[PDB]
Amino acid sequence: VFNRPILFDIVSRGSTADLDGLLPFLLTHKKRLTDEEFREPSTGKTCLPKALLNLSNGRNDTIPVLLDIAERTGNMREFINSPFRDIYYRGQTALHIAIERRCKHYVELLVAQGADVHAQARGRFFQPKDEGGYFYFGELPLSLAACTNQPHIVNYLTENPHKKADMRRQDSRGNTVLHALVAIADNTRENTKFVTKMYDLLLLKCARLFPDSNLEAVLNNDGLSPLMMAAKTGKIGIFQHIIRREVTDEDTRHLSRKFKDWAYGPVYSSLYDLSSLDTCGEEASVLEILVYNSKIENRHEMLAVEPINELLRDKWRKFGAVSFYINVVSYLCAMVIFTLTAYYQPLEGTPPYPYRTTVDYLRLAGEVITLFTGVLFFFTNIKDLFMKKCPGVNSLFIDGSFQLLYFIYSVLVIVSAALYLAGIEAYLAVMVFALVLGWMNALYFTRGLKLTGTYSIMIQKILFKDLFRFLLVYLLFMIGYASALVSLLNPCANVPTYPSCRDSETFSTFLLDLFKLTIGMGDLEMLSSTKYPVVFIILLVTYIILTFVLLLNMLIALMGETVGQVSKESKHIWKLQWATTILDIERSFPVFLRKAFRSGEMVTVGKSSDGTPDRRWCFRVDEVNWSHW
Numbered sequence: 001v002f003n004r005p006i007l008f009d010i011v012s013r014g015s016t017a018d019l020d021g022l023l024p025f026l027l028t029h030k031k032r033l034t035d036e037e038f039r040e041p042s043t044g045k046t047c048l049p050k051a052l053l054n055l056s057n058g059r060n061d062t063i064p065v066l067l068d069i070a071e072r073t074g075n076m077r078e079f080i081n082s083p084f085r086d087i088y089y090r091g092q093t094a095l096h097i098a099i100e101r102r103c104k105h106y107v108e109l110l111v112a113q114g115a116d117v118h119a120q121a122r123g124r125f126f127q128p129k130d131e132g133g134y135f136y137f138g139e140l141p142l143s144l145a146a147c148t149n150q151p152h153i154v155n156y157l158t159e160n161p162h163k164k165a166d167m168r169r170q171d172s173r174g175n176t177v178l179h180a181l182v183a184i185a186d187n188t189r190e191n192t193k194f195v196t197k198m199y200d201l202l203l204l205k206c207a208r209l210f211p212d213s214n215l216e217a218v219l220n221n222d223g224l225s226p227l228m229m230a231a232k233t234g235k236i237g238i239f240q241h242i243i244r245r246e247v248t249d250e251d252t253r254h255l256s257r258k259f260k261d262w263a264y265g266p267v268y269s270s271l272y273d274l275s276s277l278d279t280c281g282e283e284a285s286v287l288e289i290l291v292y293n294s295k296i297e298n299r300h301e302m303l304a305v306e307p308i309n310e311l312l313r314d315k316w317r318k319f320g321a322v323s324f325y326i327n328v329v330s331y332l333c334a335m336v337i338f339t340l341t342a343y344y345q346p347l348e349g350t351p352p353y354p355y356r357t358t359v360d361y362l363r364l365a366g367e368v369i370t371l372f373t374g375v376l377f378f379f380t381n382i383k384d385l386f387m388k389k390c391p392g393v394n395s396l397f398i399d400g401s402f403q404l405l406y407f408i409y410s411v412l413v414i415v416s417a418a419l420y421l422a423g424i425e426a427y428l429a430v431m432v433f434a435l436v437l438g439w440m441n442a443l444y445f446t447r448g449l450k451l452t453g454t455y456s457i458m459i460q461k462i463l464f465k466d467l468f469r470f471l472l473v474y475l476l477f478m479i480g481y482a483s484a485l486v487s488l489l490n491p492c493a494n495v496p497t498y499p500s501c502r503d504s505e506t507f508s509t510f511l512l513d514l515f516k517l518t519i520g521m522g523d524l525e526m527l528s529s530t531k532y533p534v535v536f537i538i539l540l541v542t543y544i545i546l547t548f549v550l551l552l553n554m555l556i557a558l559m560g561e562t563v564g565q566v567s568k569e570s571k572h573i574w575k576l577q578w579a580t581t582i583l584d585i586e587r588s589f590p591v592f593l594r595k596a597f598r599s600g601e602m603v604t605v606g607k608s609s610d611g612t613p614d615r616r617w618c619f620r621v622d623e624v625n626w627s628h629w
């Protein structure tokens with residue numbers, strides 16, 4: 001009487017008259033609605049989803065009857081429970097459907113008959129957008145009701161009688177509800193609004209219950225707490241909210257991270273918590289994550305909030321500034337040594353060993369100190385291979401460029417050291433590149449000043465955004481004219497001249513003359529020994545006009561558009577450069593020394609478990625407003 005296609009129509013039509021009678025029919029033939037040959041073959045869908053998906057106007061009275069029929073078959077447990085085994089819906093239930101439809105009335109229902117509030121909606125649809133999915137919310141009904149802007153459900157699901165989803169439950173990634181609100185928060189007004197509300201709500205609510213470990217401390221299956229998870233994913237609205245979190249009510253004051261130490265008229269101190277932000281070695285920290293492992297698109301807005309700017313500046317005072325200016329002179333000196341050993345390197349004979357002299361032994365100190373730097377920069381970069389390397393480090397203006405060139409410098413000293421010992425006399429040519437490359441690595445050390453460091457950033461952008469597109473065209477013209485102009489010179493199959501005849505080097509030198517010529521550095525000085533002399537002169541003039549008057553002076557113009565556009569952007573990169581410099585120094589210290597330079601002051605912010613105080617390191621920031629008396 002009721003086949004598979006029969007019912008899915010009836011319930012999809014949502015009219016509880018045509019279905020009546022399937023109750024006694026099914027009871028007789030020894031069936032239960034969940035049975036295989038009554039539910040869809042592809043997904044695994046049954047009557048109850050199809051009712052809810054095709055819900056209309058907010059209600060549909062088929063469902064209380066199909067559920068009334070459920071206990072008659074005795075499948076309520078199995079009936080409001082089902083893994084759609086579709087590889088796009090691996091775990092969706094009627095409760096996942098009840099909530100996303102904003103259908104409060106049935107969400108109260110479906111849980112009341114004791115269904116589930118923990119089903120892991122693990123389907124590829126229900127994965128993050130980078131796994132090839134559409135909507136991650138966690139994987140749970142409570143994590144959904146939060147992530148779908150439904151406060152009423154979320155309140156209910158907790159303080160509902162029958163069953164309740166604890167606010168602690170982890171999905172199949174470790175991520176709880178707060179982890180999941182960080183996964184769906186974009187940095188828009190409307191999104192950041194209702195994320196922060198519910199984030200607080202559950203966090204303040206979960207303090208009432210389980211008056212123990214904060215739910216914000218629940219690490220997921222890669223550690224990263226909701227704050228650490230926002231810092232890695234670039235979510236300012238939640239990230240900013242968490243740090244300057246000042247709750248006042250006596251119970252939930254351990255949840256605040258911005259205190260009110262003292263005030264006196266229009267001057268107001270304040271005291272931020274650095275529990276996660278600054279952890280010298282013995283914990284993961286937000287600040288390491290931002291400066292190294294995060295979204296580069298907004299990392300400057302992350303390092304420009306409440307302690308983070310003044311916490312790095314404080315490290316710069318203590319050790320950051322000093323140790324950086326030992327690194328520079330240590331490097332500038334090492335390049336003096338690599339210079340003097342090159343100006344006193346001999347130039348006659350296969351390997352110029354024959355030292356046996358106070359000078360040549362002094363040169364020997366030079367090459368050895370050099371090779372020490374090359375093997376150093378080689379290992380420190382390959383240490384970074386098993387450590388901080390493998391982002392897209394080929395064109396970043398945040399030390400991605402120099403990691404290569406110090407590696408090139410490192411390789412290129414090793415090869416010269418290999419050939420100076422393997423007899424080969426091109427130790428020199430390979431060294432010469434290493435030397436020019438090495439001084440051009442001292443631009444790394446312009447990072448300790450906005451003045452010189454912003455400048456060095458504009459050099460490299462202009463080198464990318466402005467100079468390559470210029471050489472593409474410039475080259476393209478040059479082979480065009482040069483070939484065109486070589487064609488108009490008589491061979492030396494004629495009288496052995498270059499300045500009248502052409503043979504075997506005439507192309508190559510023109511490329512240099514036509515290079516000197518556009519640079520404003522060579523003279524025409526018409527060759528004039530040509531079959532057609534007047535066509536020749538007409539072409540060089542078109543080369544000057546196009547390449548000097550028009551391309552190279554347009555190149556100045558384009559730079560002016562570049563430096564105007566990338567000035568601010570270069571100020572913001574430098575702040576990432578500068579911060580990266582500080583932590584590269586800090587990480588290079590032992591832990592006890594990092595704790596000696598520990599930034600902030602220990603404070604009893606308040607009282608906690610059995611009167612135990614809160615010994616939270618914090619960072620004072622005095623402030624003035626002549627407005628909020």
Ligand SMILES: CCCCCC/C=C/CCCCCCCC(=O)O[C@H](COC(=O)CCCCCCCCCCC/C=C/CCCCCCCC)COP(=O)(O)OCC[N+](C)(C)C
Pocket residue numbers: 531532533534535536538541542543545546
């Ligand atoms: C977008 C426009 C592109 C223009 C491209 C240039 C075009 C030129 C078109 C005309 C072709 C001329 C052909 C010359 C042929 C040639 O060479 O014939 C010769 C000798 O010479 C003549 O007989 C011509 C005498 C007249 C001279 C005055 C020219 C006035 C030119 C005015 C216009 C200048 C444009 C200037 C550049 C402006 C560019 C601005 C935009 C920027 C983008 C490019 C071969 O001698 P032969 O007897 O075989 O043997 C040698 C014996 N002997 C003669 C030396 C005793």
Ligand SMILES: CCCCCC/C=C/CCCCCCCC(=O)O[C@H](COC(=O)CCCCCCCCCCC/C=C\CCCCCCCC)COP(=O)(O)OCC[N+](C)(C)C
Pocket residue numbers: 317318319322323326327380584585588589593596
């Ligand atoms: C407002 C405050 C104003 C104060 C301003 C003046 C401050 C001056 C501080 C100067 C000291 C810091 C610089 C030292 C040199 C340094 O650290 O050089 C670093 C590395 O060094 C080392 O590896 C050597 C290890 C030993 C260092 C400490 C020795 C000095 C100890 C004295 C500290 C003074 C305080 C306490 C006492 C210590 C005892 C325990 C506490 C007791 C209670 C107080 C250079 O960087 P590098 O790794 O090359 O850069 C990155 C390299 N990479 C990874 C990219 C390849």
Ligand SMILES: CCCCCC/C=C\CCCCCCCC(=O)O[C@H](COC(=O)CCCCCCCCCCC/C=C/CCCCCCCC)COP(=O)(O)OCC[N+](C)(C)C
Pocket residue numbers: 350401408411412415423424425426429430433434436437460
């Ligand atoms: C990932 C990097 C690794 C590099 C790979 C290259 C390594 C090794 C190759 C070297 C060996 C090849 C020659 C072996 C045979 C030989 O010795 O051949 C010689 C001549 O050979 C050469 O001259 C080879 C050219 C060397 C330079 C290569 C490029 C070096 C690296 C280039 C990159 C660095 C630049 C940067 C530019 C700066 C601007 C950037 C700004 C960027 C700003 C952002 C024959 O002459 P002969 O007198 O007979 O020699 C004596 C022989 N006898 C008689 C004793 C047996």
Ligand SMILES: CCCCCC/C=C\CCCCCCCC(=O)O[C@H](COC(=O)CCCCCCCCCCC/C=C\CCCCCCCC)COP(=O)(O)OCC[N+](C)(C)C
Pocket residue numbers: 326327328329330331333334369372373376380399402403406444
């Ligand atoms: C308050 C002051 C206290 C002073 C304490 C002095 C303590 C110790 C002195 C020795 C310091 C050595 C520290 C080296 C730290 C280091 O690792 O340095 C490296 C730099 O490469 C080296 O060092 C090469 C190695 C060979 C030794 C140096 C040359 C030979 C010895 C010279 C020492 C004596 C100097 C100068 C003497 C004349 C001074 C005139 C003052 C005048 C003041 C105005 C830091 O590069 P990195 O950050 O890792 O960046 C790499 C790039 N990447 C990967 C991050 C992109």
Ligand SMILES: CCCCCC/C=C\CCCCCCCC(=O)O[C@H](COC(=O)CCCCCCCCCCC/C=C\CCCCCCCC)COP(=O)(O)OCC[N+](C)(C)C
Pocket residue numbers: 328442443445446448449450451452
């Ligand atoms: C390459 C490695 C890394 C290098 C980094 C350090 C480089 C240089 C050190 C310079 C430090 C001082 C500059 C601070 C400027 C500043 O902080 O602000 C600048 C203001 O600049 C100036 O007014 C003029 C600047 C030029 C002064 C010249 C004297 C210093 C050099 C020493 C003398 C050299 C001669 C001769 C030597 C003797 C020879 C005898 C042997 C001869 C052979 C026998 C911009 O301010 P603003 O517009 O607010 O922009 C924002 C920047 N802000 C404040 C946030 C950082």
Ligand SMILES: CCCCCC/C=C\CCCCCCCC(=O)O[C@H](COC(=O)CCCCCCCCCCC/C=C\CCCCCCCC)COP(=O)(O)OCC[N+](C)(C)C
Pocket residue numbers: 472475476479491502503504505506507508
């Ligand atoms: C994608 C296609 C790439 C194809 C590349 C094919 C490469 C080579 C083919 C040539 C093979 C022969 C060369 C042997 C080398 C040699 O030794 O040749 C010499 C010839 O003399 C020279 O001085 C060398 C002149 C070289 C000509 C280059 C032409 C133009 C090449 C253009 C390549 C660039 C493309 C594009 C630029 C894009 C720009 C925008 C960005 C777009 C990005 C996609 C042999 O001397 P010999 O005969 O013994 O004596 C001299 C002659 N005499 C006296 C007997 C009459």
Ligand code: NA
Pocket residue numbers: 519520
């Ligand atoms: Na000129």
Ligand code: NA
Pocket residue numbers: 521
């Ligand atoms: Na000249």
Ligand code: NA
Pocket residue numbers: none
């Ligand atoms: Na001249």
